[PDB]
Amino acid sequence: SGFRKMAFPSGKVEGCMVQVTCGTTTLNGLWLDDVVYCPRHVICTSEDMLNPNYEDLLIRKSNHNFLVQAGNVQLRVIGHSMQNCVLKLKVDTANPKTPKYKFVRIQPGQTFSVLACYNGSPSGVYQCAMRPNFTIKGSFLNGSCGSVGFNIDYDCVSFCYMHHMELPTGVHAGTDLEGNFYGPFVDRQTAQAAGTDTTITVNVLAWLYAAVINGDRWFLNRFTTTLNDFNLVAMKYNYEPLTQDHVDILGPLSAQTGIAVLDMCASLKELLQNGMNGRTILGSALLEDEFTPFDVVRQCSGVTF
Amino acid sequence: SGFRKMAFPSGKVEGCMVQVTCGTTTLNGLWLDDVVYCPRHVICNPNYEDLLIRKSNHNFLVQAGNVQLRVIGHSMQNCVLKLKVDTANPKTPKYKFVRIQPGQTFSVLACYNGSPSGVYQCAMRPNFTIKGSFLNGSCGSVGFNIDYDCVSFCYMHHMELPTGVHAGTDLEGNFYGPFVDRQTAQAAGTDTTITVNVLAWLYAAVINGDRWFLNRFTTTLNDFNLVAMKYNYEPLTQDHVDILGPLSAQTGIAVLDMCASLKELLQNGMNGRTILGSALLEDEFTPFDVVRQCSGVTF
Ligand SMILES: CNC(=O)CN1C[C@@H](C(=O)Nc2cncc3ccccc23)c2cc(Cl)ccc2C1=O
Ligand SMILES: CNC(=O)CN1C[C@@H](C(=O)Nc2cncc3ccccc23)c2cc(Cl)ccc2C1=O
Ligand SMILES: [Cl-]
Ligand SMILES: [Cl-]
């Protein structure tokens, strides 16, 4: 019993965190095999940040300009290349602690663990979701750039995020491990703002099925809804549209609890209308949207209470 | 910016998790040097001296990854079983066994079959239970904090209570709370809110730019404690006020000044507003967690 925002064990990722220094800029890198991956803005000198020409800044650099530190050992840079917004530093030592891994690009609504690091040293781990506006509501301070997001289903680490910047609203933007940003963001200190955020509907529904599995049904009603009527109501509360794919994905949880997806949609419609009236669901007074259908199946029991 | 429930990096602890099997019971163990620590109920009103005397070393199967460790000795310390093994753990970190107080927080590495599956942050409730997330097979999962390079082990999971909350011991086998390690009529006591932690989280909201709950008023410690008793909040002591000094100095808001904001939130609610993305007053972040997350401390 119980339902926590659970992160994956960070050990496999801790053994990959290094410190990357270029002139006066220090940030974090990810050392996998003989390559260190880091945000390309490590070559920028703050003023450069307004309109940097990365190709022009990189051509002026040599291998020995990049200092890479793994614990108390300096790694020797023997090559460098840029791939989109990521700098790839070829080093002379393959990481002996390199886990089995993949680079995966995630979609909005997906969750992942974040290993927040400063000076190549991990300081904390937390659970996150890619928001529909492609930002993440993380906890990052100056020096956290290059911190990574990941999932560890089986013994394979899937790296999905690298931290690059904080927007004016306190939310965070970054890239996949191939250097492609999530969202319409640029690694430029230009006037950039996160788009209006929406609630991840499929995740709120998954969390409602998790509340039912843990023994709570106070929020259910005798009504059902069509998918169209549900979406017309949900859009008024700034909820993401629910698609037929989302309904399909909720099938296993619907079968485990005996509550049809559109019947759970009718409970959600009513929760949006009524609020909770002094009650909580899984210890929360708000509708939680940072647990996917897959996270609920992973954490919750296979036997409902 | 941002404020998350953050756990310590679990790597140093992952390298200590093993699977312990005795008879039909399988649970988790903590392998430090040449000793595996696990709940004594792995041998199961139980008489643990009588059950243990009937066991030999070869009755305990200890698995570290895909390698079997050979048990060469065993002893009991309170509610923990200590299995002497023939191999010292090469991944043994620098560590201490510490007993924590209610209100203190720690990270939990939840495991099943000696394999870590998740990490989360939680607090020792005033009623000595932890509101964790554990399923059958989680017994022997451990709680810890990290101070520089040193892991301080503070909790070992033993059982789930009928309300879904959890009970366990320190690493010396002494239970937190009035619990016993046996399936009997046991219940969690009435819980209270950790006042010093709610105040720390209010200072964290101020540091992050959330100030709507601030007011011009102050209060005495006595008047604040009379209001806290009415709302099932733990009494605030002079020690708690002293501990909040650094956060009070960083924000310019006196502790009793913040207490007058908390009294208003208790007597009037949030009125459709949130604090750090929450509609409830959060009590599982200590003053030290707030200073650590709003500073950038690494391990
Ligand atoms: C809040 N930002 C700033 O004051 C200046 N700034 C520096 C840098 C940046 O965001 N770093 C930071 C990353 N994460 C958390 C941060 C918390 C506080 C301060 C800086 C953080 C940056 C990088 C890129 Cl690729 C684009 C823009 C910027 C930028 O605007
Ligand atoms: C809810 N548990 C039960 O009905 C049976 N039960 C088994 C066992 C126990 O609580 N284990 C579990 C621990 N954590 C999560 C669990 C989720 C589900 C089931 C079992 C879990 C136990 C150990 C000790 Cl030392 C004392 C009593 C018991 C006990 O009563
Ligand atoms: Cl995805
Ligand atoms: Cl049910």
Curated annotation (Swiss-Prot), chain A:
<protein>
    <recommendedName>
        <fullName>3C-like proteinase nsp5</fullName>
    </recommendedName>
</protein>
<feature type="active site" description="For 3CL-PRO activity">
    <location>
        <position position="41"/>
    </location>
</feature>
<feature type="domain" description="Peptidase C30">
    <location>
        <begin position="1"/>
        <end position="305"/>
    </location>
</feature>
<feature type="cross-link" description="Glycyl lysine isopeptide (Lys-Gly) (interchain with G-Cter in ubiquitin)">
    <location>
        <position position="5"/>
    </location>
</feature>
<feature type="active site" description="Nucleophile; for 3CL-PRO activity">
    <location>
        <position position="145"/>
    </location>
</feature>
<comment type="subunit">
    <text>3CL-PRO exists as monomer and homodimer. Only the homodimer shows catalytic activity. Interacts with host FBXO22; this interaction promotes the proteasomal degradation of nsp5.</text>
</comment>
<comment type="function">
    <text>Cleaves the C-terminus of replicase polyprotein at 11 sites. Recognizes substrates containing the core sequence [ILMVF]-Q-|-[SGACN]. Cleaves and inactivates human TRMT1, preventing tRNA guanine(26)-dimethylation of tRNAs. May cleave human NLRP1 in lung epithelial cells, thereby activating the NLRP1 inflammasome pathway. May cleave human GSDMD, triggering alternative GSDME-mediated epithelial cell death upon activation of the NLRP1 inflammasome, which may enhance the release interleukins 1B, 6, 16 and 18. Also able to bind an ADP-ribose-1''-phosphate (ADRP).</text>
</comment>
<feature type="cross-link" description="Glycyl lysine isopeptide (Lys-Gly) (interchain with G-Cter in ubiquitin)">
    <location>
        <position position="90"/>
    </location>
</feature>
<feature type="topological domain" description="Cytoplasmic">
    <location>
        <begin position="1"/>
        <end position="305"/>
    </location>
</feature>
